Ligand binder design. Structure first.
Ligand SMILES: [Co+2]
Ligand SMILES: [Co+2]
Length: 393
């Protein structure tokens, strides 16, 4: 019975021909942000499928090939997620045991040209745009984002409300594995890492899925006990503080690091036949902090413009969020051509309760306090998409 790192090291040890089956190589990939949820969800899916296929649950059922879990960033970028590093360390998962974009490229390359690369999607429900020339078919989906209504024949196809995608993935596999306690012990830090970060320690965004996943982990981690002590929750709380503090730690990173470490890119279609290429970076410190750590406002904005140019963006949006003395705060910063950015912001400013504090929409760079603190990137993107649909051309 291989542990997660043992499973990953086994995959790394195999020829691509023993991973593939009948000229199909199957992967599981999260979204382009490569956050805790995307990483935990992909590894969990792949690992649980492996245990299922090898065990007695899948008797009279059959088939099953390996699924390679993919993290959709360059290998070097992993260390920018200090929370994820901590969680991987708890399970003794080494970076050299993981598969990144470089590895997926090597897989597409070192396999036969006639081999199909099929993907399970977790933590998104359409293929990441950067992988659309690598992935031939989507074969299953487990996600908790807005349903784009693609790949309707996917098996499974779970797109449902959840604090964490990881909860949905775990509960799906837990049922198939008949609650296999060893699997639960072997994945718990990864699963709980995602659930607890995504729900702020089961205090926000909680759904039935997350409650059930947590209940299941608690039962296993406690073991046989005559009564339930406070220790389990105390341990979860200490674990949460470690992961949260590390997610909140971007000291020592470059501006480019900060912009790329929790980043999503979209192309909006409008009335015009050329869409809008837009990138949104989610950041855990406020603009004044970022300026102070990066040589001041001018230097920081220069680095943002460089990032925008490098990624081919019409518009770059920075979304900051933080907590101090119990209260949430957010900011929204936009960089782009003055015409497009003015129109976009004027159309979302009421909903997002935006208040200008720096720059000028007419200059193409403007900075806003966002008093709608409930609106995350998941909400801001559709608002901007709708705003863009109303622009003329
Ligand atoms: Co996110
Ligand atoms: Co997620």
């Amino acid at each position: 019975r291989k542990t997660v790192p043992e499973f990953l090291a086994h995959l790394k040890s195999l020829p691509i021909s023993k991973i593939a089956s009948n000229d199909v190589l199957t992967i599981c990939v999260g979204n382009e942000s490569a956050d805790m949820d995307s990483i935990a969800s992909a590894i969990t899916y792949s690992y649980c499928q492996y245990i299922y296929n090898e065990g007695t649950y899948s008797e009279e059922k059959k088939k099953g090939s390996f699924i390679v879990p993919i993290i959709d960033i360059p290998r070097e970028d992993l260390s920018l997620r200090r929370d994820v590093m901590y969680v991987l360390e708890k399970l003794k998962i080494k970076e050299e045991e993981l598969f990144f974009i470089e590895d997926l490229k090597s897989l597409k390359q070192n396999v036969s040209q006639g081999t199909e690369l099929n993907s399970y999607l977790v933590d998104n429900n359409d293929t990441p745009k950067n992988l659309k020339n690598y992935i031939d078919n989507v074969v299953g989906i487990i996600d908790h984002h807005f349903d784009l209504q693609k790949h309707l024949d996917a098996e499974p196809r779970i797109v449902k409300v959840s604090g964490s995608c990881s909860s949905l993935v775990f509960n799906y596999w837990y049922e198939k594995l008949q609650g296999d306690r060893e699997v639960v012990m072997n994945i718990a830090p990864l699963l709980m890492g995602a659930i607890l970060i995504d729900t702020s320690n089961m205090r926000r965004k909680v759904e039935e899925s997350d409650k059930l996943a947590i209940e299941r982990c608690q039962a296993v981690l406690s073991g046989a006990v005559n009564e339930v002590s406070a220790q389990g929750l105390e341990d979860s709380s200490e674990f949460y503080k470690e992961i949260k503090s590390r997610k909140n730690d971007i000291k020592g990173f470059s501006v480019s690091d900060i912009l790329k470490k929790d980043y999503k890119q979209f192309n909006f279609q409008g009335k015009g036949h050329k869409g809008l290429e837009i990138g949104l970076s989610s950041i855990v410190k406020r603009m004044s902090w970022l300026f102070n750590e990066h040589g001041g406002e001018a230097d920081f904005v220069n680095q943002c413009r460089r990032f925008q140019a490098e990624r081919g963006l019409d518009v770059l949006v920075l979304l900051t969020s933080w907590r101090k003395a119990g209260d949430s705060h957010r900011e929204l910063v936009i960089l782009g051509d003055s015409n497009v950015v003015r129109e976009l912001i004027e159309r979302v400013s009421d909903k997002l309760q935006l208040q200008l504090f720096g720059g000028n929409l007419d200059g193409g760079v403007a900075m806003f306090k966002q008093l709608n603190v409930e609106a995350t990137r998941k909400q801001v993107v559709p608002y901007l998409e709708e705003a863009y649909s109303n622009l003329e051309e």
